[PDB]
Amino acid sequence: AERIVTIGGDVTEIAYALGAGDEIVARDSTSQQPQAAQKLPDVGYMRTLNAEGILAMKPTMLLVSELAQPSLVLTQIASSGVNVVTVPGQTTPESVAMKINAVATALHQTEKGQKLIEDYQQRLAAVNKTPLPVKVLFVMSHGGLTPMAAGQNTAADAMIRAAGGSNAMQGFSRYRPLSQEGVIASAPDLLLITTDGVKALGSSENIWKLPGMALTPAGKHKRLLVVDDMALLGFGLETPQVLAQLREKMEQMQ
């Protein structure tokens, strides 16, 4: 009966995992998992939504990450009479259990969610969270934009800290353009980048041509880790696995 639009790759992946695949009629740009979701219509990007694109799908329920903007579009969609359910957007490993809970409560699959939660906690718990003296620089590369580093108050910065590592970039929030001096002062031991960032750059050649990268301990030892964009930053079900790659790569640097 329900025509569900899910917004937020984390939300979508959880809805699908709670067995609602059949009822989801559309989703946002950040939602690309599972692949089944890639075949659904794209209503736009979570951070720049427009009401018309969502309402054209005639949803009965909108499951939306709190990270969604502009907020008044949700108000507007709710006034039109669709059930708008908000999902917590904290970039924290403990936050995922909260996300699963809100989604399940909304789908009336409380028990299914409870099960999914235990599996996530069981997978998360297996990861060594002991702090390690390794500094990490996360870089986001587009095709047509200057490369950018993550400060604090980012998912990337939370991910790094949760793996037991340290954010090489300090003293600022969100993202900033790379500069040779900035990067070099950062002195990362490990360069963290996304799968798409790699494609945007070309080859490993261009990777170490990033401003100042070669003049860092990371660039000297070619210490690199490439992870799926949303797996790394989405704080959904794949969080434990990504923390594992990151932890392993750090431990292996002793």
Which residues are at the interface with ligand HEM (CB under 6 A)?
29-30, 45, 47-48, 91, 140, 142-145, 148, 150, 154-156, 174-175, 229-230, 233-234
Residue 107 vs 150, nearer CB to ligand HEM: 150
CB of residue 200 vs ligand HEM: minimum separation in angstroms? Answer: 9
Residue 89 vs 107, nearer CB to ligand HEM: 89
Residue 48 vs 80, nearer CB to ligand HEM: 48
**Alpha helical stretches, state H, the chain:** 9-17, 35-38, 51-55, 71-79, 95-107, 110-125, 155-162, 180-186, 195-201, 204-208, 217-220, 229-233, 239-251
The bridge status of strand 224-227 relative to strand 190-194 is: parallel
CB of residue 114 vs ligand HEM: minimum separation in angstroms? Answer: 27
Backbone dihedral region of 227: left (phi > 0), alpha (psi from -120 to 50 degrees) or beta? beta
CB of residue 147 vs ligand HEM: minimum separation in angstroms? Answer: 10
Q: Name the DSSP letter for residue 38.
A: H
CB of residue 29 vs ligand HEM: minimum separation in angstroms? Answer: 4
CB of residue 234 vs ligand HEM: minimum separation in angstroms? Answer: 6
Residue 107 vs 232, nearer CB to ligand HEM: 232
Dig out the tokens for 216 from the structure.
């860092």
Query: Partners of 149 in the beta sheet?
Result: 139, 176
Residue 132 vs 148, nearer CB to ligand HEM: 148
Residue 82 vs 236, nearer CB to ligand HEM: 236
Q: Rounded distance, CA 89 to CA 9, Å?
A: 11
Chain position carrying tokens 């309402």: 55
Q: Which of 239, 232, 221, 248 is nearest to 195 (CA)?
A: 232
CB of residue 254 vs ligand HEM: minimum separation in angstroms? Answer: 27
